[PDB]
Symmetry: C3
Subunit: 181 residues, 3 copies
């Protein structure tokens, strides 16, 4: 029933190993699964972009606090948030609070606002031109977003795993990023 | 749609900063939010009353356990439950278990029992004269309960925060309550 | 409304102390409660069987890891999973992952597959002769499973509690299993 929906594309086609959509699956369950997938994909895309920018030597100018701790002094990856020498835990708490504010008030599907598919958060407020695309281009853009989200999920998982196994003696020379210092 | 519901009163009027009720919000969502708000308000009202009673020098006679630890020997506030010198953790576990029993079996809205609004737990069992009030007085009492609950929420949060910041060097002479010892 | 359902049998008859099904309870609720009860009963039955098999001196041949830690060297009970000398935590993680796979993909009620009652996971895939039983025997087997599950919940809770109180000085001689070692 959902074998022709968004995300079922070559080469795997419809790929449901654990059988989440097996049987008479309702549209609500598939919508929930797709919403979770798109949320994770967007978060992982942002996380991978941030990891790449930080590890490329690009940091915000100035200091993260009044103490004088410069931005380009904390490590990259998990050590930047959780570790002995990381950003102040007040900064992490404020970041989490800001994310919670965004999810409660901003990053949400407001009912009766014109959203036309799962993951559409425009709510009639912010729109950069989601009407010039025809029917096929809209689906193509949504598929690009979803697949990039899946790839970024796997990539950010690999980045954290590799950053967390270096102390244990597993420090390989990764193809593009090199040694994950 | 919910701008004339209970709790929308001067001077703020309908106050929805995060936009929980924005768009075509369903009655179920508002009912859930109001239930959570009323439950928090009742819990916070009881917490503030107990905090004030304990800090005023009023304690239960006798001892909290067979060891001989008198009631008027444990500290006030968070230090009474979580700390080196607090009430026995068996007492805390029993309190939590009793609260769970009350909330699962007693402090609940039993379906098909005559409850009139969200937060009504009478269930046709305990009633002190609710039907004696006319229509306007019922709404007035409900609004009083809700607003006292909000105020007690903020007050108990402030009391806990002030208690927890005294060891950090923040010990102000709070109004009325004085130094929060 | 639910006083004649499965599980309401002599000598207690219908037994709802906390009043979960009080008032106009929906089948849905009751269905969720029965599903949770059956899941807990099956898990506890397996747990009790494993506890008995391990404590009777029956262990898998060989070693649990490449290091050489033989199966018949770890303790019995909670000490086998959580403790200083337990099975490798990699094994525990893999067991939890396998259980999660089973619940997500295998041990579930697939909609539109022919399941007749709550707890039926056949899904038209695995069946050892369920339709061979007549109506009375089907209910009898379901009641036997449910009551054995309840008894197993009590038994596994008692076994874990008795294991955890031996270091505290409470080491009684249990009737059948004797001392827990
Ligand atoms: C948050 C993660 C997440 C979620 C919720 C989904 C959700 C979905 N994906 Mg999907 N996907 C993801 C990540 C995710 N994806 C990633 C990272 C990739 C890249 C490898 C893909 C690649 C992918 C393809 C190629 C396809 C889908 C499809 C689908 C849809 C139907 C199949 C399904 O339920 O997924 C699969 C099942 C799950 C995600 C269930 C969750 C299982 C997790 C892992 C929990 C298990 C825990 C347990 C301990 C197991 C761990 C050990 C285990 C590894 C052995 C559904 C909307 C199909 C689709 O669009 O059909 C319309 C489809 O063809 N996905
Ligand atoms: C998962 C997302 C994520 C997370 C958790 C972090 C976390 C962190 N980043 Mg970071 N970053 C990210 C994405 C992320 N980043 C992206 C995508 C970029 C590229 C622009 C950067 C660029 C960046 C730099 C240049 C620096 C950090 C730094 C830091 C650290 C200090 C916090 C800070 O100053 O933030 C700064 C955050 C930014 C400059 C950009 C954040 C943008 C977020 C992701 C927006 C997403 C939500 C947004 C409101 C959606 C808008 C929708 C639209 C319709 C309006 C902290 C560990 C600093 C540090 O100490 O390095 C070690 C630092 O110097 N980051
Ligand atoms: C448990 C807390 C709680 C809950 C669930 C509600 C729920 C509600 N309140 Mg309410 N209120 C509360 C506490 C709460 N209140 C307190 C303590 C006060 C006193 C300041 C008020 C004062 C108040 C007024 C004056 C009014 C309401 C109204 C309402 C209703 C619609 C607006 C709304 O959703 O609330 C606001 C939104 C929320 C509570 C969403 C939750 C947000 C929390 C903070 C989670 C965010 C976490 C995240 C990390 C952010 C933290 C950082 C942030 C501070 C920057 C709704 C039933 C309105 C009403 O009755 O209209 C009919 C109205 O006019 N409230
Ligand atoms: C959030 C609520 C709350 C919590 C968590 C506590 C927690 C605590 N109180 Mg306390 N207290 C409370 C409210 C609360 N109190 C209120 C409202 C009062 C005023 C009557 C008191 C008066 C009080 C005294 C006098 C003493 C404590 C003490 C204590 C400590 C030992 C436990 C004990 O003996 O309780 C005793 C609890 C009570 C005597 C009253 C509890 C009443 C609860 C809130 C009833 C709420 C549910 C109720 C059944 C609903 C009825 C519905 C109706 C339709 C029937 C412990 C830290 C003792 C201590 O060691 O101090 C350090 C102590 O001496 N409290
Ligand atoms: C709650 C269930 C449960 C849990 C958590 C454990 C946990 C453990 N058992 Mg154990 N065991 C169980 C039930 C359980 N057992 C049952 C029911 C039996 C009887 C067959 C055994 C027999 C057993 C032996 C003989 C040994 C262990 C051992 C161990 C330990 C190492 C893991 C291992 O090798 O497992 C091995 C697990 C098994 C051999 C049987 C597991 C069977 C599970 C319960 C299947 C349930 C799901 C199933 C796929 C449903 C099928 C549905 C059907 C339609 C297809 C670990 C602490 C070993 C150890 O080190 O002891 C200290 C060891 O030597 N167990
Ligand atoms: C106006 C304003 O303020 O905002 C607007 C701005 C703007 C532009 C309009 C907007 C937008 C669109 C945005 C931001 C789109 C962002 C898209 C984004 C950020 C997409 C990331 C993909 C990452 C992938 C696929 C990673 C794969 C990673 C993979 C496949 C790996 O395996 C990683 C690998 O890594 C390892 C593990 C090891 C290495 O050896 C090898 C490599 C490296 C391969 C918004 C949303 O509207 C907000
Ligand atoms: C028969 C039986 O057994 O039970 C029956 C008995 C009875 C009586 C019939 C029943 C009842 C009704 C009850 C119990 C009603 C209780 C109502 C209650 C307990 C209402 C508290 C409000 C607290 C507020 C507003 C606090 C604000 C606190 C604020 C605004 C603060 O900012 C606190 C501030 O603190 C700081 C932070 C710092 C200080 O510098 C300044 C102050 C102090 C201002 C029940 C429920 O039916 C149960
Ligand atoms: C083909 C394949 O691969 O799989 C198939 C195989 C097969 C056979 C077909 C299948 C099946 C059916 C199965 C596995 C059924 C299993 C049923 C099972 C395992 C039922 C346990 C009850 C335990 C109880 C009641 C414990 C009570 C414990 C009580 C009442 C206590 O108080 C314990 C007490 O302990 C203390 C606390 C202290 C002691 O002093 C005294 C005692 C000991 C009394 C499946 C499911 O289809 C899977
Ligand atoms: C996530 C988005 C975000 C938002 C929306 C946001 C809003 C505000 C507002 C307005 C409401 C104020 C007034 C304010 C003030 C301060 N912020 Mg924010 N802040 C955010 C993020 C961070 C991070 C990541 C850090 C940080 C810090 C500080 C410090 C330094 C304190 C100190 O130096 O003692 C002060 C005074 C740093 C820190 O807390 O250091 C301990 C630091 O790491 N902030 N901040
Ligand atoms: C929340 C409501 C509540 C209920 C409904 C409730 C019911 C029962 C029942 C009947 C079912 C019994 C039989 C019972 C027995 C004991 N209780 Mg309760 N008890 C409640 C609360 C507390 C608190 C707060 C404390 C406490 C204690 C003890 C001790 C002392 C043990 C010891 O001295 O060794 C014993 C023997 C104190 C404590 O456990 O200290 C270690 C203590 O702090 N209890 N208690
Ligand atoms: C729950 C069911 C379950 C499944 C479905 C499952 C599947 C696989 C697969 C195929 C996907 C492989 C390839 C694989 C391989 C290894 N397993 Mg599994 N394994 C399961 C259970 C356990 C337990 C309980 C333990 C264990 C272990 C090992 C070790 C030893 C590593 C070492 O000696 O360094 C290796 C190499 C032991 C352990 O990890 O000890 C550190 C141990 O305790 N495994 N295992």
């Amino acid at each position: 029933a959902f074998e022709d929906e968004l995300g079922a594309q070559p080469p795997l086609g419809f790929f449901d190993p654990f059988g989440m959509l097996s049987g008479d699956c309702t549209q609500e369950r598939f919508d929930r699964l797709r919403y979770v997938e798109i949320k994770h994909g967007r978060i992982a895309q942002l996380a991978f972009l941030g990891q790449i920018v930080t590890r490329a030597g690009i940091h915000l100018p100035g200091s993260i606090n009044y103490a004088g701790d410069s931005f380009d002094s904390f490590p990259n990856g998990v050590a930047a948030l959780f570790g002995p020498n990381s950003i102040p835990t007040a900064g992490l708490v404020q970041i989490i609070a800001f994310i919670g504010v965004l999810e409660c008030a901003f990053m949400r599907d407001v009912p009766g606002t014109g959203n036309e598919h799962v993951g559409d958060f425009r709510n009639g407020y912010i729109d950069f031109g989601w009407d010039s695309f025809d029917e096929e281009t809209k689906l193509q853009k949504r598929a690009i977003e979803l697949n990039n989200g899946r790839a970024a999920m796997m990539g950010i998982l690999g980045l954290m795993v590799h950053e967390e196994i270096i102390p244990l003696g597993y420090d390989p020379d990764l193809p593009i990023i090199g040694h994950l210092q």
